[PDB]
Paper text:
The programmed death 1 (PD-1) receptor and its ligand [name] have become an important target in cancer immunotherapy. Overexpression of membrane bound [name] by tumor cells attenuates T-cell signaling to evade immune surveillance due to its binding with T-cell membrane bound PD-1. However, the immunosuppressive conditions can be reversed by blocking the interaction of PD-1 and [name] and restoring the activity of the body's immune cells to kill tumor cells. A promising alternative approach involves the use of small molecules acting as PD-1/[name] antagonists to stimulate [name] dimerization.
As part of our continuing research towards small molecules that antagonize PD-1/PDL-1, we present here the synthesis, biological activity, and structural basis of 1,5-disubstituted tetrazoles as PD-1/[name] antagonists. The electron density well explains the inhibitor structure and its interactions with the [name] chains. Compound 10f interacts with [name] through a series of hydrophobic interactions and hydrogen bonds in accordance with our modelling studies. The biphenyl moiety is stabilized between both [name] subunits via hydrophobic interactions with APD-L1 Tyr56, Met115 and Tyr123 as well as BPD-L1 Ala121, Met115 and Ile54, all well-known from previously reported similar co-structures. The tetrazole moiety likely not only increases the solubility of compound 10f, but also provides additional interaction via hydrogen bonds with the APhe19 carbonyl backbone and ATyr123 nitrogen as well as BGln66 side chain amine further stabilizing the inhibitor and enhancing its affinity towards [name]. No aliphatic side chain but hydrogen at the α-position led to active compound 10f. To confirm the dimerization of the [name] complex, molecules 10f, 10l and 10p were tested for the interaction with human [name]([name]) using a 1H NMR titration experiment and showed protein oligomerization upon addition of the ligand at the molar ratio of protein to inhibitor equal to 1 : 1, which is indicated as broadening of the [name] proton signals in the spectra. The corresponding behaviour is characteristic of [name] oligomerization, previously observed by our group with BMS reference compounds.
Residue numbers in the entry:
A (entry chain B): 4 to 121
B (entry chain A): 4 to 120
């Protein structure tokens, strides 16, 4: 169980930059993939669905296609790290990470996107 | 595998009646309390937190204090049944059941409240 903990509740980013938003969870030794579920969401649009190690491209929302990815490397450290490359204005909003790894919690994260200033 | 399934996505209810909204989940005739978590929420108000056998009373928001309860009887049958008694207009809105039982899924249910005159 415990609690999902978030380093930063707000990320302010540049248009066309990259960002990695993070949700930490209690890990403790190795990662038992059978126990792990990570869902990232915003505005009820599926960004990531990780289910015991399974991800399907097809479930992802098109706006996030080929840009958002979950850094599997950080998962073993108890860090659900969503990385979105080439941040779009439309990506501004509230993100929900939902994690289960022997008990479950969710946190909300806000994103503000600065204009490109053409 | 794990998918939360809802009989009714909308409930239209009477003011001052009771309602019971339900979220079904896969149980294999097993029903391991230690594994099960049920969170009911609406408009970011915690209604129920069933955690590992017990209802957590403390975290329930005081608007749903003596009114919302989880039907424990149904849980064994893979049915997270939130019952709220004496429905107020304020109880109209979108409910989110989050269930974790060896894997995890959520669904939204909308509630519309009638009062005839
Ligand atoms: C359909 C395939 N299954 C995966 C899936 N699909 N939609 N959502 N989802 C997973 C959701 C999830 C994942 C982890 C924890 C919690 C959760 C549980 C209780 C409290 C807080 C958070 C939830 C609700």
């Amino acid at each position: 169980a415990f609690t999902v903990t978030v380093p930063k509740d707000l990320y302010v980013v540049e248009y066309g930059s990259n960002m990695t938003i993070e949700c930490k969870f209690p890990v403790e030794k190795q990662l038992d993939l059978a126990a792990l579920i990570v869902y990232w969401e915003m505005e009820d649009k599926n960004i990531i669905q990780f289910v015991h190690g399974e991800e399907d491209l097809k479930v992802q929302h098109s706006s996030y296609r080929q840009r958002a990815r979950l850094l599997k490397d950080q998962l073993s450290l108890g860090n659900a790290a969503l990385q979105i490359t080439d941040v779009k204005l439309q990506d501004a909003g509230v993100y929900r990470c939902m994690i289960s790894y022997g008990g479950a919690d969710y946190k909300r994260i806000t994103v503000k996107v600065n204009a490109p200033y053409a």
